[PDB]
Symmetry: D2
Subunit: 343 residues, 4 copies
Amino acid sequence: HSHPALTPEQKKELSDIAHRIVAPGKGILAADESTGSIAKRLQSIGTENTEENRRFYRQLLLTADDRVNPCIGGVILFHETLYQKADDGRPFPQVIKSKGGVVGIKVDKGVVPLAGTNGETTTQGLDGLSERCAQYKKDGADFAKWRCVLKIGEHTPSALAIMENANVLARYASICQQNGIVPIVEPEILPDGDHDLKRCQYVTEKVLAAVYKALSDHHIYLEGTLLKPNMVTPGHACTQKYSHEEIAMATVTALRRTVPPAVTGVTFLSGGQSEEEASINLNAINKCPLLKPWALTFSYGRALQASALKAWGGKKENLKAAQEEYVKRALANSLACQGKYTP
Amino acid sequence: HSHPALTPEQKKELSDIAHRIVAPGKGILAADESTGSIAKRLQSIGTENTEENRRFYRQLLLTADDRVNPCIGGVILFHETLYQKADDGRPFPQVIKSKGGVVGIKVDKGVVPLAGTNGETTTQGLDGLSERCAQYKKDGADFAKWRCVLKIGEHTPSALAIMENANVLARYASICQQNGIVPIVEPEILPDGDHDLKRCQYVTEKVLAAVYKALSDHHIYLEGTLLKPNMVTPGHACTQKYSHEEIAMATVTALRRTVPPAVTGVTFLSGGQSEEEASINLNAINKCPLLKPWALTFSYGRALQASALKAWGGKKENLKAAQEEYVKRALANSLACQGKYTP
Amino acid sequence: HSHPALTPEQKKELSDIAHRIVAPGKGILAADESTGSIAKRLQSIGTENTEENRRFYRQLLLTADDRVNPCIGGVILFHETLYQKADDGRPFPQVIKSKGGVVGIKVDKGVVPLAGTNGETTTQGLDGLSERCAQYKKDGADFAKWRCVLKIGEHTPSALAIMENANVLARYASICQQNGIVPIVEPEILPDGDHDLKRCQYVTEKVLAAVYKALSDHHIYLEGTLLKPNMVTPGHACTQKYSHEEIAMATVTALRRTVPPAVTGVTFLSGGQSEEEASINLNAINKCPLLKPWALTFSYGRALQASALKAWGGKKENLKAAQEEYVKRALANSLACQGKYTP
Amino acid sequence: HSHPALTPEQKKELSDIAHRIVAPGKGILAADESTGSIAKRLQSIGTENTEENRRFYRQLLLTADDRVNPCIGGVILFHETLYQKADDGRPFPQVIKSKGGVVGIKVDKGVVPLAGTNGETTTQGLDGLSERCAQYKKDGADFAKWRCVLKIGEHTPSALAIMENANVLARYASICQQNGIVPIVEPEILPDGDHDLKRCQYVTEKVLAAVYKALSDHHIYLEGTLLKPNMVTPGHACTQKYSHEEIAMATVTALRRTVPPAVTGVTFLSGGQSEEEASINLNAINKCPLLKPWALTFSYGRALQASALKAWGGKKENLKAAQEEYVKRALANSLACQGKYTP
């Protein structure tokens, strides 16, 4: 017997937010880096990690030129960045919503190793999640993000890891959809190792199928859900070389065999690629001559901001130039969303 | 680790046959009625059930006018009809392939009641299936058909019935794809009872999701598979009345939430409807303003041939008129495949 | 391929602790009541809820006579009670271990309603659980407790609720076994409603089978795990009446069809029964003439302490008499563990 | 909601037959060899395979001395042997029931390779099984046998093979229990290869857990079911050497972690061992100092009859001596059932 999880108005908000995020030509900037990863990135660039530098760097990211207004539909933030204010006086969620963007927040509490596996981990962060999503919904967060990690090994991914990560993602998305927050499932598959297109494509199919079975099990309103997969790409130690067209064909085959078409949009990871390779691959994916009945766009953390961070270097007066650099990649990625990119 | 079930040439035959079957404007005639059901139908029309009458009736179905040549892409036969010859001397598979059609065969051995359930049955017919499909492949059968039955009850469909029927369908489709025969999965849901659009749509989602999970489990090459679902329609004792647009919206929602887009085509059942209601509903489904990234066509057993059987009546000299009647429905259903039908 | 979750020494501690807890004639006192439930219980008895009254009441429970030393193998505490000290100066974990008992702690963070179900809830409390169990292991907690809730309804328990609760229990038990803490799974089935012995026995089989499948999936060392089920008992509004022998037969049938015999012991709930009915039923269960290859004992929260709380009334000078009352039930329950109870 | 598969009288026959089969000190002779395997065995001994030689050899097996009357509780036959008569005039089922034995029949139709796996096969034989079991029940068969095969490889047994074989075994046992025939599940794991005690024990746990989950899913009355597992033994190419006590400890650990204690008895395979090694191992298993709450006995096809077949050689006049040889092993195996064997 059916007791509906959602009223039709709840489905209306989830569908409208998911359509406004993944709108044609728009993408996702992921400024959600925690203090450890951003500490590594500020230590590489050669500055001290303080709250002021992090706030100023996200100022450099967020208040860039109005040319990125038809580029970014939504920005993912850390928890701390929701309660930081810009030097103009405006809080960063209002900064995001003022230029048409949507506020999100990365909500997981890290990765926990699973017993008995070969280095396989699950994700943490389920306690207090309804109250926290209610609080973030009061502060203007309209979508969320959760990151599960899987690695390709000798006999990994085992069935235990895929089942547990799929069940956790479905539980998370149910809780987020209860509170009027569009969830984004991110089934990340680690690119480390040496494996061809074929095996990585294979485990991509198994992982995405288990995810969508668990989503059907937990009554998830799939019209208000976004998918964040990685491009099927060979391992870093894999010796074989492939054109970008084969990678695009393999991605659209791995999606067209799994993703049911009510899922509103597909946002890709960069996954340790270069700044240009991700845009080239996404432009290839948007040019693949099969029938792709959803939005195909980008959600790039490092691939948007890495070289702009390099051109910043920790000095304020370089800012505009660094900001200009960021805009460049954004504009390129916008073309990568519509297939009209050419390098 | 991946050991591929299919060579790329095997995928090439399966994809080419599935594309030739479900080709735009073409549909499936199901003349696969067994001796009991066709015995009931000949007893209703008032003639004796012999081999000669069955052969002559399928002669009346199969050698109709050449106007049905851009109508039927494929015909489903009983096992016996593959070894019957027409009075011209040509065997019925050659009759089918001569006018552009593709030979199929219904291969299941009936329904067996499941213990402990409330009148829920599974399907039979797995033994010797590889040899039988090899034999039918030698005789010109290029696709198959398997029919599982589920009924909507108080606490039915239980999880046991859906799991067992999905596993049996996947096992069947693996065996058929091994031998170069395109399988057609038919997840029939019984329209008996009293239930709204909502509950029947709900159990349609659960059943189709479990089916596609089991197909992903058994490495089924989904580009060479056809789907045969029923239209989500209220029960026969249900008191509420619905327009055909609501039924079309519910069907395309129940498909767009489940069917991955590599599945080549969707052929509907008639499911106890009238001869005109099925064509009206299919014309509505082909006019629904959502994105349907596959072929939507008909596979009508009774809805093609019932009134033509009525105009036959068991007398040979009425034949042409009866045949003319059949052509009428076929032409209508062809328009129901392309959305340009108007009654 | 097998990467063992546990070293053999880890299996040795888990087995030794589980054997010391469930030792023949010993049981579990559950003083783990949170502030809301104990607030309701102090408000019923007519005293104000303060930290001093809670500490003093658990003083009344814990420092009772030495006759309960061969009665209680282990005590379950709230988190707060681990950091309260007795008026002698000794902390309550040392109080427990001084008279032969083992310290436990209830670790879940409550129940969260599942979307789309009919009032079905999951359990919360997975974040930070490895660090918290390491901290409690430093403070002397050797076992844990987690409480999932399921209710018998019209079409409930659904498959979603049982699957999610089983996966959460297995994840919890893996985390606890990683840190050297013996987990106790508690699959509680709510006794509310009107349902016979038959349906409650049925859903007990389904729930326990799904739990043990998920435990086999997560590589749980079942020799170091305790099971906390409820006795299969009809609903509160059920009109049919049953002898205690039928309830004992149904419990031992529902366990002997599911529990694999390496699971070290089975501790029952009281589940809203009377103070005497639970002891009578447990004495019947220990007299059932089938082969029960494990320890069958009690884990009684209310059924040990309710009437002793009544004889306390919130006044200190009644203490000993109230404590004497507690000892009475404990002694009775000890006989209920060995089948030699007679009321 | 519960609709009981079995009336209590049906449970009474299943329990009584299962108790009479596995009765203390009794075992199972498996004369169920099909024409191919027995053709290989008659070709090794150097005689022509005819119906007369097969009938005469099973005469040599079945009408041995009355000292085997407290040895064999039941005999498994091929289908053909049920309709062969002895030279006295009595049919072989009456021969079996006259000396206290129970007639069984091997009912599967062989093994079929699964697509996409690495040499993994499922089992066949489900069609017409209710009618065939009704027919064998009329002829005096009171139990059955079904044999699924799994091999230990690099990345095998995969989850697909274990799931499919468990579902097929449960479906088979439901059908057999519907007709009043006690099923015997045989989850055979192939001993070929090189693998330690540890990995074979591991996959034994996974396989048996999946089997019992599928049996709980299909409402199987486990008091009327027998289990036929193999002893966990290293591979034929494995270099490490183990005492028989370690093999006995590993078997009783692999059973005590999985088998719920209502399953009436456990009958072992010989599995390519010597004639003496199987009896030594079973005597060790019956001497393992853990709590084994079921009957542990033998079901030996080759290990009972191989050397007796050797002492036959295809000549009639050696018969008695050959028969005497058979009795020897039987008597030894009877002691192997009670732990009082000493070689």
